[PDB]
Amino acid sequence: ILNPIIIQRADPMIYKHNDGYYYFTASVPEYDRIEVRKAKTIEGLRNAEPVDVWRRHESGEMSNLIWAPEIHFINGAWYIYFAAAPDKNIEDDTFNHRMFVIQNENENPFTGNWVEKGRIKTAWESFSLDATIFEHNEKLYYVWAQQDINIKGHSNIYIAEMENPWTLKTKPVMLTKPELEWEIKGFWVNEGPAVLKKNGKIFITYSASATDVNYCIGMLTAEENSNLLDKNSWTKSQTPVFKTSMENHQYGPGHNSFTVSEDGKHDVIVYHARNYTEIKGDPLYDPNRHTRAQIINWREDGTPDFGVPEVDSL
Ligand SMILES: [Mg+2]
Ligand SMILES: [Mg+2]
Numbered sequence: 489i490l491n492p493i494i495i496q497r498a499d500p501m502i503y504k505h506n507d508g509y510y511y512f513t514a515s516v517p518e519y520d521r522i523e524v525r526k527a528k529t530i531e532g533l534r535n536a537e538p539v540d541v542w543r544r545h546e547s548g549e550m551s552n553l554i555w556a557p558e559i560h561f562i563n564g565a566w567y568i569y570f571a572a573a574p575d576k577n578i579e580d581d582t583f584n585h586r587m588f589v590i591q592n593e594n595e596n597p598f599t600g601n602w603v604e605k606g607r608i609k610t611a612w613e614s615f616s617l618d619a620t621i622f623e624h625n626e627k628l629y630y631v632w633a634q635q636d637i638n639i640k641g642h643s644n645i646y647i648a649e650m651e652n653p654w655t656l657k658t659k660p661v662m663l664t665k666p667e668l669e670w671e672i673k674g675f676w677v678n679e680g681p682a683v684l685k686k687n688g689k690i691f692i693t694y695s696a697s698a699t700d701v702n703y704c705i706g707m708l709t710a711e712e713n714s715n716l717l718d719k720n721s722w723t724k725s726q727t728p729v730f731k732t733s734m735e736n737h738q739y740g741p742g743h744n745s746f747t748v749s750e751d752g753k754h755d756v757i758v759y760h761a762r763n764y765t766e767i768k769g770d771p772l773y774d775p776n777r778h779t780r781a782q783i784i785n786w787r788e789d790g791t792p793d794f795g796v797p798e799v800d801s802l
């Protein structure tokens with residue numbers, strides 16, 4: 489794969505649909521809308537024309553800092569899960585994002601049939617973002633980042649089971665909080681969860697530390713038939729599974745997703761990183777996190793080896 493695939497797109501999410509095609513969304517640098525594009529191949533996404541399917545509200549809950557959309561197809565309909573804030577105030581050390589979802593029941597997600605389901609409520613109200621979804625044994629799970637005032641830092645990773653694609657039916661179960669030295673650089677953060685199933689296991693990668701050079705990816709692992717809503721089922725990687733490569737000039741890799749290659753043979757990690765280190769301004773407004781993709785290697789023991797972020801090809 490020739491990297492980067494797409495410049496100036498953060499929190500990249502590629503979904504390979506059953507029409508053959510890959511659909512991509514991401515955080516745009518203006519944080520003001522949800523862009524989607526389609527192509528037959530991963531590298532085809534570079535040149536695919538993006539379409540804004542949804543734009544921030546003028547005021548109120550979905551009006552600011554539109555972050556990290558993911559496009560999913562569940563039970564015959566499209567869902568895009570995203571976060572948004574009512575303003576840019578900082579309260580309890582963080583922005584005040586909540587989580588939303590828009591649904592499109594039409595086969596073609598570019599049609600103008602996106603319905604706001606509203607706010608996906610959890611057991612308490614605080615900074616919440618970066619939701620993703622997975623299915624196991626006909627149950628649907630929601631995995632997301634949220635702050636708890638009684639747990640140190642900006643956000644922890646939670647899982648819950650869902651009643652439907654916009655509604656939880658359990659309390660949040662905390663799986664990781666920021667605490668290891670590589671999770672607490674800049675800010676104490678666990679965010680950007682992504683789920684990969686392979687080898688009788690479920691892997692939840694997540695990103696940690698601030699969104700500069702220190703950003704990196706950790707991982708939780710569970711046996712697929714364990715009790716997924718018990719923290720003790722999940723083993724937390726002691727060191728990052730993916731991090732800055734000083735040698736390759738790729739800095740702060742993170743907020744990954746997972747897809748598969750065109751022939752279906754390989755798993756692919758899709759992530760953002762910068763190719764310079766001295767940002768010299770507020771990182772939130774530096775637009776140069778670029779979207780990148782690499783093949784995942786599998787070890788003898790069934791665990792994934794993500795390697796290192798590869799050098800730019802262009
Ligand atoms: Mg599917
Ligand atoms: Mg506080």
Ligand SMILES: [Mg+2]
Nearest residue numbers: 558618620680
């Ligand atoms: Mg995500």
Ligand code: NA
Nearest residue numbers: 579582583584
């Ligand atoms: Na906050």
